Design a binder for this molecule. Structure first.
Ligand SMILES: O=c1ccn([C@@H]2O[C@H](COP(=O)(O)OP(=O)(O)O)[C@@H](O)[C@H]2O)c(=O)[nH]1
Ligand SMILES: N#C[C@@H](O)c1ccc(O)cc1
Length: 474
């Protein structure tokens, strides 16, 4: 019999990426895979890159099925409207997914298809676990961000119990002294402050979607057969040991993409700029500041201008990925100082890049990052120190660990100002600060390589997951 694994990501590129990594590995190991897209995600991908590039090749088409489910969303809903996405998916996708499972079962008789043997749902996509359990199909969940991020979400309930969520005083939502308050009761992260919790807790709404959905997700994941985390156990050991008490067995597989590399489908709405790596080839080793904020976050036009002026005055060449819709509001021209540096060849601004390859390029010496987890995993594998500007979600949690525990990063002020940006970049490029963070980044690069190579801790967890949980085919 052939195992048949159905995988269901949340519609964001940072969620699709790790589940697609796993789906391709399972297909390589001989499994049948059904990858489930929401119609929102599928139609947006089609209009950006065309059906041929989004769907599987003909060589893999036999055992790699793409299925699409309804979600009731307009394609106009932007990626930064996380609450709108989350609320529609949890309300609209369960019955479409239940129907999909039924049809996959009918295809056993109808076309000799393999019965479904496991569902791997993103933790967010609680309907996938609900439908699998109803149908008596094993399900395992994949949390796509950091362990420390999960630990913060897990403690949303405790915030509610302590009267901290919802915020009873709206004036405290952005009060920096209040947000600095230590939360000494979080196991595994004694240094958590209120601001270091994933940012969706900062709400006055007692029916807030993201708080509600978080609680649903934690309860769902606690009932799963296992939890997959795309992190390095050695990096997040104290956090993972604290999470162990609240979840089924946890498999730390990170960086999954590097485990796979040790040993045909576009998942992005943006086209990776091919000039990047050639431009970096022309720059000295370690000389370039690489700036990128991932696939969902947006910033203000004022923040964008201060980043631009800071980059122009920081003393280093720079590669800035400025996502086409990253700035809120109408298009504003970049400052002349930056535009002149681009004209001189000292800087380069592109809409999207091949991020893992850029971070591994010898010309890059620093990553200015929003602290999205996949981006941090790519920085960790590459050995790049991080200058952090967290935006939303668990980016704040990740930044707290980058600064206080992992040791491979430093933080910018949330209020962007060109002079402080230039000063901190300079410190990271030539100061004792950067020497320390870069040295620690080198240590984590070695640790990641050891974990991902055959026999390493993450490699061993991937083998156990792939074999004993997913290819069993009972
Ligand atoms: O120029 C870019 C920037 C990002 N990414 C990819 O987009 C995802 C960003 O995920 P992350 O978890 O860092 O952040 P999010 O987008 O969820 O904020 C990762 O797979 C990156 O490799 C990319 O392909 N090109
Ligand atoms: N930010 C962000 C997204 O990655 C996200 C989606 C759903 C969640 O429940 C939490 C976070």
């Amino acid at each position: 019999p052939t195992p048949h694994v159905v995988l269901v990501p949340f519609p964001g590129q940072g969620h699709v990426a790790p589940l697609m990594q796993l789906a391709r590995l399972l297909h390589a190991r001989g499994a049948r895979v059904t990858f489930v897209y929401t119609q929102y995600n599928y139609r947006r991908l089609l209009r950006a890159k065309g059906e041929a590039a989004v769907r599987p090749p003909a060589t893999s088409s036999a055992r790699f099925r793409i299925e699409v489910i309804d979600d009731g969303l307009s394609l106009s809903v932007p990626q930064n409207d996380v609450g709108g996405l989350v609320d529609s998916l949890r309300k609209n996708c369960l019955h479409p997914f239940r129907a999909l499972l039924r049809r996959l079962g009918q295809e056993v008789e109808g076309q000799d298809a393999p019965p479904v043997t496991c569902v791997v749902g993103d933790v967010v996509m609680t309907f996938a676990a609900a439908a699998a359990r109803e149908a008596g199909i094993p399900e395992v969940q994949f949390f796509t961000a950091s362990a420390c991020g999960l630990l913060g979400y897990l403690h949303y309930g405790e915030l509610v119990e302590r009267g901290l969520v919802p915020f009873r005083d709206a004036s405290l939502l952005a009060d920096d002294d209040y947000l600095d308050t230590p939360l000494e009761w979080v196991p595994g992260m004694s240094h958590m402050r209120l601001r270091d919790m994933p940012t969706f807790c900062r709400t006055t709404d007692p029916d807030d979607v993201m708080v509600s959905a978080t609680l649903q997700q934690m309860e769902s994941a606690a009932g799963s057969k296992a939890l997959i985390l795309n992190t390095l156990y050695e990096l997040e050991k104290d956090v993972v040991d604290a999470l162990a008490a609240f979840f089924p067995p946890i498999y730390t597989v990170g960086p999954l993409a590097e485990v796979i590399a040790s040993s045909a489908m576009d998942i992005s709405i943006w086209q990776e700029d091919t000039r990047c790596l050639s431009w970096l080839d022309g720059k000295p080793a370690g000389s370039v500041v690489y700036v990128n904020f991932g696939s969902m976050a947006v910033m203000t036009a004022a923040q964008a201008r201060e980043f631009a002026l800071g980059l122009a005055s920081c003393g280093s060449p720079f590669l800035w990925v400025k996502r086409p819709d990253v700035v809120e509001g109408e298009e504003v021209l970049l400052p002349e100082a930056l535009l002149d540096e681009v004209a001189r060849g000292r800087g380069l601004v592109v809409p999207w890049c091949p991020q893992a390859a850029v971070l591994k390029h010898a010309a890059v010496g620093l990553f200015v990052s929003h602290c999205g987890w996949n981006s941090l995993l790519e920085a960790t594998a590459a050995g790049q120190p991080v200058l952090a500007w967290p935006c939303h979600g668990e980016q704040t949690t990740n930044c707290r660990q980058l600064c206080e525990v992992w040791g491979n990063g430093a933080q910018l002020p949330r209020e962007v100002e060109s002079g402080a940006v230039a000063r901190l970049v300079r410190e990271m490029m030539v100061g004792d600060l950067g020497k320390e963070k870069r040295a620690k980044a080198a240590e984590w690069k070695a640790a990641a390589e050891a974990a991902a190579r055959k026999g390493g801790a993450s490699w061993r967890n991937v083998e156990r997951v792939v074999n004993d949980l997913l290819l069993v085919g009972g």
